[PDB]
Design a binder for this molecule. Structure first.
Ligand code: BYB
Length: 225
């Protein structure tokens, strides 16, 4: 597990600077190696469809730093079973709106990453408004990240600006539920739309190393490793 995952990433890092290089050196990361020889991802966030359907339309989005960005905005009432590390949850969202995120308790790194990744994934208006600094990042291979991966990187590193822009509400009163604050502790207020439940939520190729479905929609790639 430890030696395997590290070995998978090291092959992909050198191959991108690409599919033909990765197969020769061989002969999230390990799933790309298996697909080359013979679940939707957004960084560490793993998603699986529960309900609804999404459709992507390009829009010019004003974001909080004053720039206008061309972003593939998804439309439709949707629900996803989500996971980041050991943290499990259910995400309900619509066009540029996180409507509800029900999660289980986990180590704080995973709870925080799940919440941030879901806020970014939702394309919520408040998340776009929370950008302050520069978001043009070039990745390890010298490639400019797409707008959605720029926001992921930005907010994973600067989470405090997001949460204060996101806002808070009174925590739910149901016995199995509690709220979660900005420090990822149980709280009588909660990040808007987010709740923690004590009830265990159940468990679940392109030349540039991007895995594709039969329809066309890509499920994971190099940016997710
Ligand atoms: O939209 C994209 O360009 C890609 C990028 C790489 C993974 C994700 C997120 C970024 C996305 N791919 C896909 N996204 C979705 C999707 N459905 N509903 C959504 N709401 C927000 C969102 F953000 C993505 C989606 N459905 C099928 C996909 F195949």
């Amino acid at each position: 597990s430890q030696s395997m995952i590290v070995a998978c990433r090291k092959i992909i890092r050198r191959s991108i600077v690409p599919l033909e290089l990765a197969v020769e050196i061989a002969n999230v990361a390990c799933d790309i190696i298996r697909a080359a020889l013979g679940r939707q991802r957004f960084g560490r966030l793993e998603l699986k469809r529960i309900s609804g359907r999404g459709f992507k339309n390009d829009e010019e989005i004003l974001i909080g730093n004053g720039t206008i960005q061309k972003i593939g905005i998804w439309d439709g009432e949707e629900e996803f079973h989500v996971r980041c590390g050991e943290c499990r949850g259910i995400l309900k969202k619509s066009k540029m709106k996180l409507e509800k995120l029900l999660i289980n308790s986990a180590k704080k790194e995973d709870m925080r990453d799940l919440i941030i990744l879901c806020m970014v994934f939702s394309q919520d208006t408040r998340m776009f408004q929370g950008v302050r600094g520069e978001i043009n990042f070039l990745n390890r291979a010298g490639q400019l990240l797409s707008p959605m991966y720029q926001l992921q990187r930005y907010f994973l590193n600067r989470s405090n600006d997001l949460f204060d822009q996101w806002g808070y509400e009174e925590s739910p009163k149901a016995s199995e539920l509690h709220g979660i604050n900005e420090s990822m502790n149980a709280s009588d207020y909660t990040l808007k739309g987010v709740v923690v439940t004590r009830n265990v939520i159940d468990d679940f190729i392109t030349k540039n190393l991007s895995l594709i479905k039969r329809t066309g929609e890509v499920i994971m790639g190099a940016n997710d490793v």
